[PDB]
């Protein structure tokens, strides 16, 4: 009778879950153009944790400067400078941007193959 429903089962992010969830957010227009922040991404990651069970350790991006590409193949959002373009990547303001080609092209792995061994 405890009135809180249990946490849904936990699992690591996969290509297909990232693809599926990217496309859902695209249909809803949920992230497109939104200024990135640590807190906003946390709300995003925790919403996926809560509704689907994915540990929030997957949504990482290449270090920049410039466009930041997703380390997780299948996630179809990248982060794009909205005030381009700076030398210090930590000063660049970014927005989420959907890119359909990220479903087929692992851009992060081509720019930074060292992350993948």
């Amino acid at each position, epitope marked *: 009778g405890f009135p809180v429903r249990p946490q849904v089962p936990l699992r690591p992010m996969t290509y297909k879950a990232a693809l599926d969830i990217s496309h859902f957010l695209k249909e809803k227009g949920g992230l497109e153009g939104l200024i990135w922040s640590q807190r906003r991404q946390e709300i995003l990651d925790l919403w996926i944790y809560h509704t689907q069970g994915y540990f929030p350790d997957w949504q990482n991006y290449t270090p920049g400067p410039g466009i930041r590409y997703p380390l997780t193949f299948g996630w179809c959002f990248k982060l794009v400078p909205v005030e*381009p373009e700076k030398v210090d990547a930590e000063k660049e303001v970014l927005v989420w941007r959907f890119d359909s080609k990220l479903a087929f092209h692992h*851009m992060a792995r081509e720019l930074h193959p060292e992350y993948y061994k």
Partner: nanobody
Framework: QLVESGGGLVQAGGSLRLFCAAS????????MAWLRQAPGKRREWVAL???????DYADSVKDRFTISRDNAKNTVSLQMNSLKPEDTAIYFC??????????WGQGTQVTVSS
């Protein structure tokens, strides 16, 4: 060496196709890019073509520019449509390694008037 050509005088709304011939330097395992520099301003990334032929573009460049590569010739091209005066710049080709631009040419001048 990286030697770009194709630059010239363009009327607003016109098109231009740029071309780079690359020497050295192992080309087929190189991510390639086009950048541009206006006068006084800071260099701006324009387009990227990845080792496996995958592409990306700046915002200001949209569905106007198209970057392509041809592996038989150590060559990379940039098709530019619907040109505007703010596209005026020196355009150059570069090799991208990780987050940095390894090599780059002196470039070719594009001047768009209205």
């Amino acid at each position: 060496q990286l030697v770009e050509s194709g630059g010239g005088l363009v009327q607003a709304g016109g098109s231009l196709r740029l071309f780079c011939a690359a020497s050295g330097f192992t080309f087929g395992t190189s991510n390639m890019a086009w950048l541009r520099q206006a006068p006084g301003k800071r260099r701006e990334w324009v387009a990227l073509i990845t080792i496996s032929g995958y592409t990306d573009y700046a915002d200001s460049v949209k569905d106007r520019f198209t970057i392509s590569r041809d592996n038989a010739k150590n060559t990379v091209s940039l098709q530019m449509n619907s040109l505007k005066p703010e596209d005026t710049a020196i355009y150059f080709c570069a090799r991208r390694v990780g987050s940095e631009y390894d090599l780059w040419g002196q470039g070719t001048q594009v001047t768009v008037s209205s």
